[PDB]
CSV table of C-alpha atoms in Angstrom, one decimal:
chain,number,residue,atom,x,y,z
A,1,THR,CA,-0.2,0.0,-0.2
A,2,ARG,CA,1.1,3.7,-0.5
A,3,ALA,CA,1.1,6.4,2.1
A,4,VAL,CA,-0.6,9.9,2.0
A,5,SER,CA,0.0,11.7,5.3
A,6,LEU,CA,-1.4,15.2,5.4
A,7,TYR,CA,-1.5,18.5,8.1
A,8,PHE,CA,-5.1,20.1,8.0
A,9,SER,CA,-6.6,22.5,10.7
A,10,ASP,CA,-10.0,23.0,12.0
A,11,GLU,CA,-11.7,24.8,9.1
A,12,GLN,CA,-10.4,22.4,6.6
A,13,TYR,CA,-11.4,19.3,8.8
A,14,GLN,CA,-14.8,20.5,9.9
A,15,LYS,CA,-15.4,21.5,5.7
A,16,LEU,CA,-14.5,18.0,5.2
A,17,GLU,CA,-16.9,16.7,8.0
A,18,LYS,CA,-19.5,18.8,6.7
A,19,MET,CA,-19.7,16.7,3.7
A,20,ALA,CA,-18.8,13.6,5.6
A,21,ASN,CA,-22.1,13.8,7.6
A,22,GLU,CA,-24.0,13.9,4.1
A,23,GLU,CA,-22.6,10.5,3.7
A,24,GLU,CA,-23.1,9.7,7.1
A,25,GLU,CA,-20.0,10.3,8.8
A,26,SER,CA,-16.6,9.0,6.5
A,27,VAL,CA,-13.9,11.9,6.6
A,28,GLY,CA,-10.5,10.1,6.3
A,29,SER,CA,-12.2,8.2,3.2
A,30,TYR,CA,-13.9,11.5,1.9
A,31,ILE,CA,-10.6,13.2,1.7
A,32,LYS,CA,-9.2,10.2,-0.3
A,33,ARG,CA,-12.6,10.1,-2.5
A,34,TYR,CA,-12.4,13.9,-3.4
A,35,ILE,CA,-8.7,13.3,-4.4
A,36,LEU,CA,-9.6,10.4,-6.5
A,37,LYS,CA,-12.9,12.6,-8.1
A,38,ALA,CA,-10.4,15.4,-9.0
A,39,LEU,CA,-8.0,12.8,-10.4
A,40,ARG,CA,-10.5,11.9,-13.3
A,41,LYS,CA,-10.2,15.4,-14.5
A,42,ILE,CA,-6.2,15.6,-13.8
A,43,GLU,CA,-5.7,13.0,-15.9
B,1,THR,CA,-2.1,20.5,13.8
B,2,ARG,CA,-4.9,17.9,12.3
B,3,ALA,CA,-2.8,15.2,11.0
B,4,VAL,CA,-4.7,12.8,8.6
B,5,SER,CA,-2.8,9.6,7.1
B,6,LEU,CA,-4.2,7.5,4.3
B,7,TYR,CA,-4.0,4.4,2.1
B,8,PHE,CA,-3.3,5.2,-1.6
B,9,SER,CA,-2.0,3.1,-4.6
B,10,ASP,CA,0.7,3.5,-6.8
B,11,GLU,CA,-1.5,5.2,-9.8
B,12,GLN,CA,-3.3,7.6,-7.6
B,13,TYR,CA,0.3,8.3,-5.9
B,14,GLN,CA,2.0,8.9,-9.4
B,15,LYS,CA,-0.6,11.0,-10.9
B,16,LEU,CA,-0.2,13.5,-8.0
B,17,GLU,CA,3.5,13.4,-8.2
B,18,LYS,CA,3.4,14.2,-12.0
B,19,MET,CA,1.1,17.2,-11.3
B,20,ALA,CA,3.8,18.3,-8.6
B,21,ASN,CA,6.9,18.0,-10.8
B,22,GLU,CA,5.0,20.8,-12.8
B,23,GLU,CA,5.5,22.5,-9.3
B,24,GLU,CA,9.0,21.4,-9.6
B,25,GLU,CA,8.3,18.6,-6.7
B,26,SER,CA,6.1,19.1,-4.1
B,27,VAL,CA,4.6,15.6,-3.5
B,28,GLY,CA,2.2,15.3,0.0
B,29,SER,CA,1.6,19.5,-0.2
B,30,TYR,CA,0.3,19.6,-3.8
B,31,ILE,CA,-2.6,16.7,-2.3
B,32,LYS,CA,-3.6,19.3,0.4
B,33,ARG,CA,-3.2,22.4,-2.0
B,34,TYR,CA,-5.7,20.9,-4.6
B,35,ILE,CA,-8.3,20.1,-1.7
B,36,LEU,CA,-7.9,23.7,-0.1
B,37,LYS,CA,-8.5,24.9,-4.0
B,38,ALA,CA,-11.5,23.0,-4.0
B,39,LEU,CA,-12.7,24.0,-0.7
B,40,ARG,CA,-13.1,27.7,-2.0
B,41,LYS,CA,-16.0,26.3,-4.3
B,42,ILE,CA,-17.6,22.8,-3.2
B,43,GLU,CA,-20.8,23.3,-4.8
């Protein structure tokens, strides 16, 4: 497996949590999902 | 600080590394920057 370690703050994490609560809580997976959703436009 | 460590794979990493080489190598920071760019206009 590959290893993606980041360093957010409260605003960034809670804005991710606001989307994750619509998914019924998932924040760590939501962070990955959003990158993977962007990757479909990047390549 | 709000640490976030996640479980990616080679393609998903290398697509972000290929973008980071445009910035002249910033892999790990480019990831967060893309999410922070998207957070300005999620909707």
